[PDB]
Assembly symmetry: D3
Homo-oligomer: 173 residues x 6
């Protein structure tokens, strides 16, 4: 069950996202994690967040989906509290090092990472989603991202900078 080998971790590029949504091509988790990392780096800096917080978000961004090399990627609406609890235990056996990073993340780093994780998905569908369901999913995710941010521990000035940058970025995507 545990992932221990580089040949397995390289299969990040074999793991397809958007398994219930029509898209122009199958996005893999390697390109997704790179893009989330980029957003954490750039937007954490734009928002003036402490370097240690941005570093922690970026480190997690690069590995956060490695368990999917075994579990697959599953749709957000399907991940109810009971399923998430079961998956957290399974994921901790698959990638104990990722579980340890997750358990060490500061709340501000977690909220930066989560904002960027969802933003990347909205940005991806803006270009590559196909049809009415994909459009609805893109807009639902955007609403969920905003609600989570607004309710988070991040200072309002940080929230506003993140939304400023998100909106500038999606307009040009």
């Amino acid at each position: 069950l545990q992932i221990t080998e580089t040949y397995e971790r390289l299969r990040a590029s074999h793991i397809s996202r958007w398994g219930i949504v029509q898209t122009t091509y199958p996005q893999n988790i390697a390109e997704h994690m790179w893009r989330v990392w980029l957003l954490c780096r750039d937007w954490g800096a734009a928002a003036g967040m402490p370097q240690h917080t941005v570093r922690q978000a970026c480190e997690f961004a690069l590995v956060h989906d490695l368990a999917e090399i075994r579990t697959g990627d599953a749709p957000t609406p399907h991940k109810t509290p009971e399923l998430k609890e079961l998956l957290a235990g399974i994921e901790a056996q698959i990638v104990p090092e990722v579980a340890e990073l997750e358990a060490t993340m500061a709340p501000e780093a977690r909220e930066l990472w989560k904002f960027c994780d969802t933003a990347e998905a909205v940005l991806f569908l803006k270009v590559n989603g196909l049809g009415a369901h994909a459009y609805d999913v893109q807009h639902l995710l955007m609403e969920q991202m905003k609600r989570r941010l607004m309710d988070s521990v991040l200072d309002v000035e940080v929230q506003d900078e993140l939304m400023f940058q998100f909106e500038r970025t999606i307009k040009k995507t």
Copy 2:
């Protein structure tokens, strides 16, 4: 949660299989279910199984993965007994009519359907799998299909006919 609308059921063709395996293109559950149906029809007849059994297998083949329109398709090795139990309850809320069919299936119809479900996957990867992991998965599934068949309630003569037809078919695929 429950799937009630034709526009949702049409998204069978938006649901991608093989989410952790490299393939030439993303196979959807609509083409998969059609092919499983075909195998049930043809091989059930070749094996001389009663018409009522073949009909029941075929009826289930056409709908068996509809819950994945919500849950996504998840990899076989990941579906442990505890996860399957949780998924069975969720799937019964998503598609109660499919759950009722599943609960009514005779053992012989279930074993025909399961043989054909796994055979279709082996046949798909034979053409469309890419790389060493996909090759291993193709061969693992073939071993699992044979072991399940050999341990099933199907008469040995039926088992032998199913394996005869499978091997003729894969040679020409």
Copy 3:
């Protein structure tokens, strides 16, 4: 010429539609037949059509394009009366069992199947068509579907239910 083997019938998923229309990916006849079957099942029931009629439409939906495993799929505008006559004889040698089903279909079952066959194509292009020609084809097919339905032997109440369901479905596709 005659198709007799399961390995050949499995090549339904190797037969590409839309050979003269730009699309996001090459749809195969297996996913098409599954979707037409689904529409026959759901919309035949919604329209209150007799069970025997819906069953006959569904049975034909699952096999109606098997001859294309040999002939290929050819564009609707190209199928003039003289070509259709030649193709009907060739198709009857390729898949005599499908030709027998076609010759037994009741008019009401044929009109349900034909409505759903064309509706599926409109629905597919709505999501997956690319460019001005594909858009024109989508709209032409929709006009042809409506004209055929309006001129058919189906009761007006059945026609209206089919159009009600079609329009609800395309809005959400």
Copy 4:
């Protein structure tokens, strides 16, 4: 019916080949005609054929499939003598200028073009065909190409040069 507009002729790149054969991607008739043109140019010269013959083959290579913008591309085994006769009349209404070129082609130019037309297909499948059926088709076409060449009016020395070049090319493809 007649193709008269550049916007229609540009849809050569919207016309997919190999509609009954599994391939890595859908090859269009524009890339096919370019490659056939190239083979006519290079191999006609290598074989020492008269410039006027090579020019005529090349001119036809660039337009020979334009009718498929309306008819679609249909599989070689399906094109029986009776269907070809019907298609020739339809194609002459679609693209009268191509029909006139075809009717003017010298036998030696026709045989060069036909050798290159089939060679291009073998070469394409060598790289891009998937599965056992595609492999059989690749090899069948190669046998058909050789038989037609050997029975043609081309001088044996020209036949041998064409086969020399074909075999060198496929080894490196």
Copy 5:
């Protein structure tokens, strides 16, 4: 370095364009050159240009990107004067016959070819471009095409016919 073999020239269909722009699929230089050839042929004739000029543009259209089999296709904005100078020398060693054709082209043939080369790209992105950057590139190329044409040695009546045909064609693409 020099391209001398047919097996190499056939790799035109292995050379992908739009390497910095999101598209629905990777267009190759073989389909691009065929389409540019078509535009030169049709629009040169529509504009009443001398046959010798149209022939020269068409001949160059079919080979103009062969050096990319070695160099790759590189984005227009990246090709500054200093890079173009270096690339011209490299390209002349790769395909001396193409360099000789380029050096012999009459100004009117060059301007026809260049108009059609850029028009083909605009037309391709109109159907197959994805996202805001691709949209901007499509429109930038269209502006560049018009500016080059307006400043060229082509007679105003020829310029107007080329723009007339371009605009009719893109509306139907």
Copy 6:
């Protein structure tokens, strides 16, 4: 010219590699950089290299191709010394921060990164390359990787560990 915006850096996933090589799909530079990062992390650790060296290689791996968002990705054989010199100056204007990182990299970190950069490409083609040219490129890159490693400043024990891990990984890819 300079890349300054997150919306531009996100287009890493719009930049296609392998522009002169046939592949099953167009790999982008985001998934490539993630995989190179992974190899630097895992194999640098396996080889016992100092943490500061592995960190520097990993940091560069994540950004090393950002200039390609403007320049495109160009084939290795095409990058002669004179072209590389011109490209280095252009790349330093496009991404000055990447140029600064490159100029600060220690030789041991550079050699780790370069080994992993080439290894990733070999590993990618092992799964996703198509045809004889792609096969030759895969094997050429592997020979080049080994020659560079053997001639590098890395200790022989580090070289041997890198080759040990590479060979174990490719066997399972």
